[PDB]
Amino acid sequence: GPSVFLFPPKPKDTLMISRTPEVTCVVVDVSQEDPEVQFNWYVDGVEVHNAQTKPRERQFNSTYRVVSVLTVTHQDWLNGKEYTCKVSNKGLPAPIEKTISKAKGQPREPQVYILPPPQEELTKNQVSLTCLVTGFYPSDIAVEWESNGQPENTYKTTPPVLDSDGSYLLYSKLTVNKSRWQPGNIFTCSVMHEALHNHYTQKSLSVS
Amino acid sequence: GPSVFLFPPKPKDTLMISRTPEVTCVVVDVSQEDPEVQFNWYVDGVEVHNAQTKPRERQFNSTYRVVSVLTVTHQDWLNGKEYTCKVSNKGLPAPIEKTISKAKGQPREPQVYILPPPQEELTKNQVSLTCLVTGFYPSDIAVEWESNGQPENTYKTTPPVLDSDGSYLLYSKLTVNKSRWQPGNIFTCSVMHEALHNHYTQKSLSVS
Ligand SMILES: *[C@@H]1O[C@H](CO[C@@H]2O[C@@H](C)[C@@H](O)[C@@H](O)[C@@H]2O)[C@@H](O[C@@H]2O[C@H](CO)[C@@H](O[C@@H]3O[C@H](CO[C@H]4O[C@H](CO)[C@@H](O)[C@H](O)[C@@H]4O[C@@H]4O[C@H](CO)[C@@H](O)[C@H](O)[C@H]4NC(C)=O)[C@@H](O)[C@H](O[C@H]4O[C@H](CO)[C@@H](O)[C@H](O)[C@@H]4O[C@@H]4O[C@H](CO)[C@@H](O)[C@H](O)[C@H]4NC(C)=O)[C@@H]3O)[C@H](O)[C@H]2NC(C)=O)[C@H](O)[C@H]1NC(C)=O
Numbered sequence: 001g002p003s004v005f006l007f008p009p010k011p012k013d014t015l016m017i018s019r020t021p022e023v024t025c026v027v028v029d030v031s032q033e034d035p036e037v038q039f040n041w042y043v044d045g046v047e048v049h050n051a052q053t054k055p056r057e058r059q060f061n062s063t064y065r066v067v068s069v070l071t072v073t074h075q076d077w078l079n080g081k082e083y084t085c086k087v088s089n090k091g092l093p094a095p096i097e098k099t100i101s102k103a104k105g106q107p108r109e110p111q112v113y114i115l116p117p118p119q120e121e122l123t124k125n126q127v128s129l130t131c132l133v134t135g136f137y138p139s140d141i142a143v144e145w146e147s148n149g150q151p152e153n154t155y156k157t158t159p160p161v162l163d164s165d166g167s168y169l170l171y172s173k174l175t176v177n178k179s180r181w182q183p184g185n186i187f188t189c190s191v192m193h194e195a196l197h198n199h200y201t202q203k204s205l206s207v208s
Numbered sequence: 209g210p211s212v213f214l215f216p217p218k219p220k221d222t223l224m225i226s227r228t229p230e231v232t233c234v235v236v237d238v239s240q241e242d243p244e245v246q247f248n249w250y251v252d253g254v255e256v257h258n259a260q261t262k263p264r265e266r267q268f269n270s271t272y273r274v275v276s277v278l279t280v281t282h283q284d285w286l287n288g289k290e291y292t293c294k295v296s297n298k299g300l301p302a303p304i305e306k307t308i309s310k311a312k313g314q315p316r317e318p319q320v321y322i323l324p325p326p327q328e329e330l331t332k333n334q335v336s337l338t339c340l341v342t343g344f345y346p347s348d349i350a351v352e353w354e355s356n357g358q359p360e361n362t363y364k365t366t367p368p369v370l371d372s373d374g375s376y377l378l379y380s381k382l383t384v385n386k387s388r389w390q391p392g393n394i395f396t397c398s399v400m401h402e403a404l405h406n407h408y409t410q411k412s413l414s415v416s
């Protein structure tokens with residue numbers, strides 16, 4: 001029979017208010033004369049009606065896959081609202097309800113540390129500036145790099161890494177050209193998380 | 209019908225003689241009264257007869273799961289030898305050949321750097337020393353931390369991270385009580401990977 005998969009908004013949508021944090025409910029495995037199924041949504045047990053439900057998409061494996069996206073506020077999601085996608089079929093003994101919400105647990109503020117290169121690497125053609133971030137719970141978080149004010153193109157971030165106390169940690173690397181490093185340019189890692197002042201913090205450094 | 213999953217030896221075991229590196233062939237979904245099945249092993253198209261096989265392990269979900277552990281040398285694996293576990297069944301008609309071998313690609317030497325704490329952190333009651341390993345390939349790699357010879361209990365390590373050029377990178381944090389950091393001690397990272405001198409390299413640092 002068919003199967004439901006409810007998904008959470010992005011750790012970056014949930015924090016900033018320019019983007020829209022959304023909650024996506026998905027159905028799969030709806031056979032070929034199973035008529036339309038119907039999203040009933042509920043937030044903490046009351047029916048909202050603003051979910052932009054989409055059409056009935058065909059799949060390579062000849063199934064029907066259905067989606068309903070539902071916009072939510074950041075206030076709401078981070079207050080621990082319990083969002084629910086109920087689905088009735090036309091050809092299924094039951095209706096299927098799934099529910100989702102923010103992670104439970106006393107949120108913990110990280111602290112950011114920029115780290116410089118190593119005195120070994122400074123002679124190299126490029127160098128690796130390091131943003132260590134640690135102590136953060138919940139695991140959902142976001143990092144960016146900017147330079148003089150202008151944002152940075154290329155960098156790489158590890159997935160969060162569970163720590164021995166139950167907090168999470170991660171590292172982020174930034175390759176910068178040996179050329180561009182020296183002339184006292186100034187570089188800054190910036191981090192977004194539930195438990196920050198303005199949900200936002202930066203460290204920064206120079207060639208000192 | 210039944211399915212066959214072949215699995216390689218882990219990087220640590222592939223890198224030193226002390227340990228024994230193994231190639232594991234696992235069949236799952238051998239049904240209720242379908243009798244035994246055989247492993248026919250081959251190495252680059254020649255049959256070896258040394259796999260320490262175990263007998264049929266029945267599962268919760270009511271199938272028969274079978275395993276054969278074949279042992280290899282390290283020179284064998286790093287020469288890129290192709291190992292195959294073929295399965296005769298007494299049920300579904302076919303043989304099921306499955307093949308495994310080392311990752312293809314010109315190996316790259318991991319360049320490793322210890323990084324000290326950040327000035328910021330020092331007033332905390334613990335500190336975080338950082339081993340950064342970059343530019344390595346294949347992704348199979350092992351990191352350990354020791355101090356005055358003795359190894360370390362707490363050390364976390366990110367899973368490798370694909371880089372913009374195709375090499376991999378990773379980080380490792382070591383938390384040490386500040387009571388251990390600042391009375392004159394020496395600390396050391398240790399890295400293992402095929403494209404190295406003696407498949408092993410280490411950096412080290414101290415309160416200078
Ligand atoms: C027919 O095809 C469809 C379409 O898929 C396509 O089919 C064929 C043609 C191939 O080409 C496929 O390669 C192709 O993808 C099949 O639909 C699939 O159905 C399976 C189930 O049979 C679903 O499995 C689930 O997967 C989700 C993860 O799905 C996300 O991530 C995938 C990649 O990571 C991505 O492909 C998906 O589209 C989806 O992607 C994310 O989507 C969100 C929302 O849009 C988006 O914001 C993200 O950015 C995006 N991410 C990425 C990386 O793209 C997974 O969550 C499920 O795991 C849980 O459930 C398992 C039980 O099935 C269980 O074993 C797990 O341990 C895990 O347990 C859960 O844990 C959660 C969280 O930790 C927790 O709440 C619970 O404890 C627990 N919950 C549950 C319910 O168990 C699950 O594995 C596929 O998502 C789905 N694919 C697509 C594309 O929709 C269909 O099955 C096929 N039918 C047949 C008969 O074969």
Ligand SMILES: *[C@@H]1O[C@H](CO[C@@H]2O[C@@H](C)[C@@H](O)[C@@H](O)[C@@H]2O)[C@@H](O[C@@H]2O[C@H](CO)[C@@H](O[C@@H]3O[C@H](CO[C@H]4O[C@H](CO)[C@@H](O)[C@H](O)[C@@H]4O[C@@H]4O[C@H](CO)[C@@H](O)[C@H](O)[C@H]4NC(C)=O)[C@@H](O)[C@H](O[C@H]4O[C@H](CO)[C@@H](O)[C@H](O)[C@@H]4O[C@@H]4O[C@H](CO)[C@@H](O)[C@H](O)[C@H]4NC(C)=O)[C@@H]3O)[C@H](O)[C@H]2NC(C)=O)[C@H](O)[C@H]1NC(C)=O
Pocket residue numbers: 211213215216218232234236237267268269270271273
């Ligand atoms: C009945 O149950 C059994 C037992 O499982 C258990 O059953 C129930 C009771 C629950 O408790 C389960 O939670 C529990 O697991 C079922 O047996 C399972 O069968 C499925 C297949 O149906 C297997 O799926 C495959 O999984 C492997 C990974 O398996 C490793 O990792 C698991 C955890 O991550 C671990 O549980 C396994 O034991 C095994 O563990 C590893 O083992 C090695 C060797 O011993 C060891 O060195 C490792 O340290 C160890 N690791 C860990 C973390 O423990 C996965 O590789 C497969 O994925 C490939 O294939 C998929 C398609 O099947 C495909 O979607 C993927 O993309 C992927 O692609 C392959 O890989 C590469 C890279 O992508 C690609 O280049 C290849 O070309 C491609 N090849 C193929 C062929 O696809 C796959 O997902 C389970 O492992 C297996 N579980 C166990 C424990 O054996 C049984 O199926 C059940 N039967 C029924 C009817 O329900």
